[PDB]
Symmetry: C2
Subunit: 216 residues, 2 copies
Amino acid sequence: QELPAQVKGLAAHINLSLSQDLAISESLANSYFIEQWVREGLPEERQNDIAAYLARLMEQLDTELLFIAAQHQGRGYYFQLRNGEFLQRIIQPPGSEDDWYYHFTDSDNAYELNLDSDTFSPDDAFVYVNYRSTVNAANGRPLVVAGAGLDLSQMASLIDDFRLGGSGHASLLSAEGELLVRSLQVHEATRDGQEVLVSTIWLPELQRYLMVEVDK
Amino acid sequence: QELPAQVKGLAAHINLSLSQDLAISESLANSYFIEQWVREGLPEERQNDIAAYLARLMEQLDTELLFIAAQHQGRGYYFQLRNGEFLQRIIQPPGSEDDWYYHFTDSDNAYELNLDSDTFSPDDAFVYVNYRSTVNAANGRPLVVAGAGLDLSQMASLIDDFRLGGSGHASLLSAEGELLVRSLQVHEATRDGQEVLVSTIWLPELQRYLMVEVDK
Ligand SMILES: Nc1nc2[nH]cnc2c(=O)[nH]1
Ligand SMILES: Nc1nc2[nH]cnc2c(=O)[nH]1
């Protein structure tokens, strides 16, 4: 049976791409230079530097968004490099859209992959790689929560990266059944028109399932 | 046949570990802060900072050695964090042991995994993750060549990480037959005493082959 092993290998491909992104996100969240920039009071004079730094990562990871959420004097600051623009704002109280932060920082997870609409542009939704810094602020929250906001179209192109015979559909869903993107125990099911074979597997790094259809 | 697929999966495990190391090495070689420290003339005043920075990576990658080779005014400087010590020296001409540099910088490879004896301590030999910076100096050489020096004992523990049935031996060799470490088309060969099954596969990221023996 080539199809099950092929599904496992493609899942491994997705895993290694996300793992490169995750390692870079951890190194960014625990960056000594970013922590020193935070302790210095986040001077605007060095912002350009910071931008360049994040640029060097965006070129390597090919991700649309890069974000840094810093804590200083009890205030949270959200910075984002995207499309050459370096945007900055203040993190909102838990009653607004930034409650995700209060979520991830209240969980004991070192990292989570939460899908959410962008706070600078609510129209676009991204898959955010929230990684927590080892250092904690005086209020108990992570000093830095940095990572990469992935454009879901890329998600579509890297699952469309490999196709079995050039046909079939590959889908990636969430744990509640919310579908994220579209291009072990294998089963056979009759689809509308013609029958197909389906087989699913769950990714722990993404917290999310993966299905695939194949005909002849 | 479970053994071939198991060999492929363990090779994938080795690949993903080395890939985390490689991504961190690339981000370090193309670090904007390191490049600014180089352009500033490599001030000793900031050395502590640099050290801390590299420390933050060594804690994440669990690698014995971290190295940075910088170019400034036509002179090459070799820095290494290891065991809490921040060592620094001048890169030797091609007639000495640093010729590896002139090798890797003369190849069009973005990165190479060269095994070599340490230049600060010739007794210990490491597997060096040489990654080239995108920026080039005025003399045409990479402005920064940074990465991680892996202790081969770790290499032994991550191939001993997974064992089939708790028996058998897994070996990793070079392209000339030089064995690196010890714990597709499968073949059967009679070893001294009792017969065994052997199957090998080549890793492109490591440029190196992988064998494995199994009895019953
Ligand atoms: N909306 C939103 N923006 C983010 N920026 C970083 N992480 C997130 C997240 O989870 N949601
Ligand atoms: N000896 C030695 N030291 C290194 N430091 C970084 N790369 C190397 C290498 O290839 N050889």
